[PDB]
Design a protein around this ligand. Structure first.
Ligand SMILES: *[C@@H]1O[C@H](CO)[C@@H](O)[C@H](O)[C@H]1NC(C)=O
Ligand SMILES: *[C@@H]1O[C@H](CO)[C@@H](O)[C@H](O)[C@H]1NC(C)=O
Ligand SMILES: *[C@@H]1O[C@H](CO)[C@@H](O)[C@H](O)[C@H]1NC(C)=O
Ligand SMILES: *[C@@H]1O[C@H](CO)[C@@H](O)[C@H](O)[C@H]1NC(C)=O
Ligand SMILES: *[C@@H]1O[C@H](CO)[C@@H](O)[C@H](O)[C@H]1NC(C)=O
Ligand SMILES: *[C@@H]1O[C@H](CO)[C@@H](O)[C@H](O)[C@H]1NC(C)=O
Ligand SMILES: *[C@@H]1O[C@H](CO)[C@@H](O)[C@H](O)[C@H]1NC(C)=O
Lengths: 366, 346, 224, 50, 198
């Protein structure tokens, strides 16, 4: 730590000791059902963009490796998460939103986009965490005579708020003369047709779009992926996995009075101080296991290679990663004598150390 | 605002004003000497036993080596300040058990053997009035491990890599030095500050002090009881002001409060995102893949390193101020206690 | 129906998240009811729709248990799934089913597609009750609290934080709302939520005890 | 700009520290002037005979 | 005419606060110190002000430096003339040469150039596409504008922290000089100093 082969007399802060974790604990809710992703990604007909269908997924175990088997897409484009880490952690509820657009408007299915679909049909919020899945459907949602079964809304009074729907079909008016239900001069129907043909270009093909919307855990978790639980131990520094969040610390029984809607407890530095176990409705205090600072007390290497080690701030019945107890920690390797001299190496609250003949050894004194 | 009462002294070219009496005044000057010694572990503050964060923290060079070096220099400088101010006497002088000094009554400033820490009454009041933060100079990890009542700020500081180091000289050593200085002043005069302590009766020493300000020494010997009574009344008024008024010791309370508030700000900075998606490092590591979490970890590392740098720079500036005040206190210890000063308002 | 006006008197505080905090002052920014506001007292013996503007505070001080449920929407005469809440001595079924009900929603003590049929404990048991409704990002949030008021004259002083009960998963374009009656009279208060910044105070048991509205007077801005 | 304010809110309390430091400097300047010049308890004035 | 530097400092959030004591109050304090020095000597700094004729006070000052007081009384007009000539020389040097007051001018100039640099740092791009937030918010969508605005925020925050740090160091220097000025007020004006070159 000094980048030198010879050290001088004094006390040096070298490193920190940390108690390593022994076991691992995974605590997940006891859920045995399977999530209906096959009925979402494999359907005969999907709904129109202005009337998009929302499916609520809950009380099941979700495996995301079958999504590639169910549908022939390329990119599993997620925003708040990653595709490869979806099977480890878990959420409260998952929503699936299904519609068919053209190839030009796939880029508008994104947080912070404007246009036709993103402003009048389907708007994503700015803090959207989830994945957007899009794939070509020229062999299913196209006809040689023109597919008119899918409609889009291009005329509206105002922009659409996130996750809103508009199903009402009224004659849009853009002038002072009222339409009064008659599509005449300055009157247009807001529902226009895609008109899908297989002879169109690659940017005009139908695209089947499924939007998976995850919400982070605030309520006790109803959907969680495939992971076997582990029995709970206490009063040991372990690695825990409580409903998707990891960490290292010591779990003890807690005297905190949680309200029944509360599942966690945070500290001032925004760290999970207390946790609620998902299997048994029990409150557990999380505290990190023992640590501290280590100071090495030495004379020069010209004098001797003997050292004394001060474990700073700890009460060393808890020492490991003569023995004398100071108020700066406790001292290992120096023998406390009942004599007083001038200070040579300052240790702590009135305690010094020196190298004295009376064989040579390191002594500590006041 | 008013600058003071209007006065107009009666000046003439043949008129003088000569005082016919006097008063003995005892005033109080309070000077900071040291501050709290702290140590910060970067690897636990920034990362918190995450291996990936440590591996990306080694890419930033030796910023924490010089942060640690600066904090160590401040910590040694505090003990040096206390040593320069208080350890000025060579021998621990003791007062003889016959406590008669011409009628001057030093019981409120000389120590007593009833309590373990042999402090005086005025020192007891001064130590009771300046409330402390009760920081990590006393070990508290056994208490921080046991969750009792509510979590303290000190346990949140300790659990995030911030530590308070105890001073080298304990409070009873400072009280021993102060008592030795008082015994040398009372029994010897100023002779103990320039060589060997030569004893002198206290009335004759006070007559030397009266000769030092241009007053003939028979004025003391003809007014000894009045001056002794005035000194005793002024000491009693210092007692009553210390028992009643609580705003006199604001400098040492400000020294305590700044060091508490800086560590509280350093703990509260850990909840910031600094443009990342989360302030929690394990959430970033679990929700994301390698590269995107590396980007978010870099954002958090840059923000926490900047906050730590700001703390260390402000600590260096405050240590410079404290060192200037301690140099002034050591000069006042040499010139007022160990001698008699002709400098005006010193 | 008869209208009156009453001071809010520092009421209408709810828990902003499901995270336990104790012995700490927290700063939140959410749709709150501002302190010492001007709420409206309605005496129902007689009714146009009350507008839903950025959330609605609701309260009732009725011992005889007459007020029972609401309808939230825009038109409320069929054609759109709006809301339905019925709270009798039996279960408390929250429905989104339209009904084509009359313009005077009275209950007698002598429809179409449906999505939500939640059944839970009785909401209704000196029985002052509190309600906060909110519509943010398609989510309908409902908060509630009961308080044993001693002197039933107006809205009392002190604090009683509101705890979340039901989170409906969907709701679009809530602009108006209405209440009900029960006959064999009613008296409710309506307050309006505004995007204020609050400074919440938690005790050692994790209960919200005091709060400061940061935009009320300059002393509260100094406190914030 | 509201977007810049919302993005600046994510940086913690750097500006509270900057405001505190500037306030301390500003109070310290008035303390400097008071400690140099207000060394007299009464406002004496010179007699008219010069 | 044209936009001032102080207006451009003011429009960007930089404000200069007035001191607590006005210049008339400092002049009142200075005149009180001068009147107490002339009409009393050093007696007004150690208690009540006791009057003494100025020739007798000056004889006390001569007695303090090791010269007997008959030297003043036998050379009073010569010493008065030498004092008046030296005061006139100070008048001539102050009306002629203006290079003596460079310390206070440096105090003014440092505070001027620090605020000028802090204003001029708002034109820097800091790796973004522009230094204007409105151009970034109009040209780009939300994510790209967030990236560019974050770069500008980091740069402006760094420059503001640099300003505050150098202001703290300059304030430490100013406080040391003010402590020296308070000591020289206590020891040169309110008394007579035996310290050499003080
Ligand atoms: C999960 O475990 C708890 C306690 O071990 C039990 O009460 C509950 O019924 C279990 N749930 C299921 C679905 O098995
Ligand atoms: C979709 O479902 C139908 C009917 O169950 C089935 O015939 C078809 O093979 C399924 N598609 C895939 C890709 O499994
Ligand atoms: C902590 O240290 C003190 C000091 O000697 C000791 O009395 C106490 O027993 C220690 N606590 C333990 C060992 O739990
Ligand atoms: C002394 O003072 C008196 C009264 O002011 C004045 O008349 C006289 O001229 C003064 N003495 C001298 C030498 O000026
Ligand atoms: C003054 O001295 C006497 C002894 O002569 C002592 O009893 C008394 O307590 C002293 N005064 C104070 C205020 O302590
Ligand atoms: C509340 O608003 C009504 C509307 O006019 C007004 O008459 C009443 O005085 C207000 N209440 C106050 C200001 O307390
Ligand atoms: C917290 O709850 C305990 C147990 O009921 C009670 O004794 C204590 O007074 C409560 N603290 C408060 C109300 O501040």
């Amino acid at each position: 730590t000094l980048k030198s082969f010879t050290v001088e007399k004094g006390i040096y802060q070298t490193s920190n000791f940390r108690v390593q974790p022994t076991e691992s604990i995974v605590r997940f809710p006891n859920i045995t059902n399977l999530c209906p992703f096959h009925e979402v990604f494999n359907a005969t007909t999907f709904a129109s963009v202005y009337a998009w269908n929302r499916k609520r997924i809950s009380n099941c175990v979700a495996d995301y490796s079958v999504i590639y088997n169910f549908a022939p897409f390329f990119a599993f484009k997620c925003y708040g998460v990653s595709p490869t880490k979806l099977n480890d952690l878990c959420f409260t509820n998952v929503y699936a939103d299904s519609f068919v657009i053209r190839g030009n408007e796939v880029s508008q299915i994104a947080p912070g986009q404007t246009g036709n679909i993103a402003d009048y049909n389907y708007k994503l919020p700015d803090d959207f965490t989830g994945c957007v899945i899009a794939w070509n459907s020229n062999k299913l949602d196209s006809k040689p005579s023109g597919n008119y079964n899918y409609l889009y809304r291009l005329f509206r009074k105002s922009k659409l708020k996130p996750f809103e729907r508009d199903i009402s079909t009224e004659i849009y008016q853009a002038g002072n003369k009222p339409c009064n239900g008659v599509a005449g001069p300055n009157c247009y129907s807001p529902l226009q047709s895609y008109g899908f043909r297989p002879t169109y270009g690659v940017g005009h093909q139908p695209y089947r779009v499924v939007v998976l919307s995850f919400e982070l855990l605030h309520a006790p978790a109803t959907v969680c992926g495939p992971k076997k639980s582990t029995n709970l131990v206490k009063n040991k520094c372990v690695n825990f996995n409580f409903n998707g969040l990891t960490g290292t610390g010591v779990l003890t029984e807690s005297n905190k009075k949680f309200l029944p809607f509360q599942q966690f407890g945070r500290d001032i530095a925004d760290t999970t101080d207390a946790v609620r176990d998902p299997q048994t409705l029990e409150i557990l205090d999380i505290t990190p296991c023992s640590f501290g600072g280590v100071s090495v007390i030495t004379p020069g290497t010209n004098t001797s290679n003997q050292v004394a080690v001060l474990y700073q701030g700890v009460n060393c019945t808890e020492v490991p990663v003569n023995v004398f107890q100071t108020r700066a920690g406790c001292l290992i390797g120096a023998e406390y004598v009942n004599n007083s001299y001038e200070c040579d190496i300052p240790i702590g609250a009135g305690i010094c150390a020196s190298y004295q003949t009376q064989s040579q050894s390191i002594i500590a004194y006041t | 605002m008013s600058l003071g009462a209007e006065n107009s002294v009666a000046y003439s070219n043949n008129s003088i004003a000569i005082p016919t009496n006097f008063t003995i005044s005892v005033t109080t000057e309070i000077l900071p000497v040291s501050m709290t010694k702290t140590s910060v572990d970067c690897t636990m503050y920034i990362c918190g036993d995450s291996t990936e964060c440590s591996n990306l923290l080694l890419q930033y060079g030796s910023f924490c080596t010089q942060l640690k070096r600066a904090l160590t220099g401040i910590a040694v400088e505090q003990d040096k300040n206390t040593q320069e101010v208080f350890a000025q006497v060579k021998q621990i002088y003791k007062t003889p058990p016959i406590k008669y000094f011409g009628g001057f009554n030093f019981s409120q400033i000389l120590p007593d053997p009833s309590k373990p820490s042999k402090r005086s009454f005025i020192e007891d009041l001064l130590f009771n009035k300046v409330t402390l933060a009760d920081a990590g100079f006393i070990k508290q990890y056994g208490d921080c491990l046991g969750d009792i009542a509510a979590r303290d700020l000190i346990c949140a500081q300790k659990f995030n890599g911030l530590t308070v180091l105890p001073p080298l000289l304990t409070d009873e050593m400072i009280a021993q030095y102060t008592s030795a200085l008082l015994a040398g002043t009372i029994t010897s005069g100023w002779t103990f500050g320039a060589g060997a302590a030569l004893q002198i009766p206290f009335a004759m020493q006070m007559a030397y002090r009266f000769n030092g300000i241009g007053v003939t020494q028979n004025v003391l010997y003809e007014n000894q009881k009045l001056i002794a009574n005035q000194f005793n009344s002024a000491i009693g008024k210092i007692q009553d002001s210390l028992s009643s008024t609580a705003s006199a010791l604001g400098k040492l309370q400000d020294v305590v409060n700044h060091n508490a508030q800086a560590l509280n700000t350093l703990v509260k900075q850990l909840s910031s995102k600094f443009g990342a998606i989360s302030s929690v490092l394990n959430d970033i590591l679990s929700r994301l893949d390698k590269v995107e979490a590396e980007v978010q970890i870099d954002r958090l590392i840059t923000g926490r390193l900047q906050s730590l740098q700001t703390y260390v720079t402000q600590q260096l500036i405050r240590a410079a101020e404290i060192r200037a005040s301690a140099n002034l206190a050591a000069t006042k210890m040499s010139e007022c206690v160990l001698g008699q000063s002709k400098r005006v308002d010193f | 129906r008869t209208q009156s006006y009453t001071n809010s008197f520092t009421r209408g505080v709810y828990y902003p998240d499901k995270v336990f905090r104790s012995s700490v002052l927290h700063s939140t920014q959410d749709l709150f009811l501002p302190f010492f506001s001007n709420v409206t007292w309605f005496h129902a013996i007689h009714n146009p729709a009350l507008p839903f503007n950025d959330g609605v505070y609701f309260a009732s001080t009725e011992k005889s248990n007459i007020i029972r449920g609401w309808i939230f929407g825009t038109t409320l005469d069929s054609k759109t799934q709006s809301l339905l809440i019925v709270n009798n001595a039996t279960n408390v079924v929250i429905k989104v089913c339209e009904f084509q009900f009359c313009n005077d929603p009275f209950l007698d003590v002598y429809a179409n597609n449906c999505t939500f049929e939640y059944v839970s404990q009785p909401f209704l048991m000196k029985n002052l009750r509190e309600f906060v409704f909110k519509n943010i990002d398609g989510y309908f949030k409902i908060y509630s609290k009961h308080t044993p008021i001693n002197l039933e004259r107006d809205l009392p002083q002190g604090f009683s934080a509101l705890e979340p009960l039901v989170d409906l998963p969907i709701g679009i374009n809530i602009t108006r709302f209405q209440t009900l009656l029960a006959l064999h009279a009613a008296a409710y208060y309506v307050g309006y939520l505004q995007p204020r910044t609050f400074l919440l105070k938690y005790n050692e048991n994790g209960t919200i005890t005091d709060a400061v509205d940061c935009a009320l007077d300059p002393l509260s801005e100094t406190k914030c």
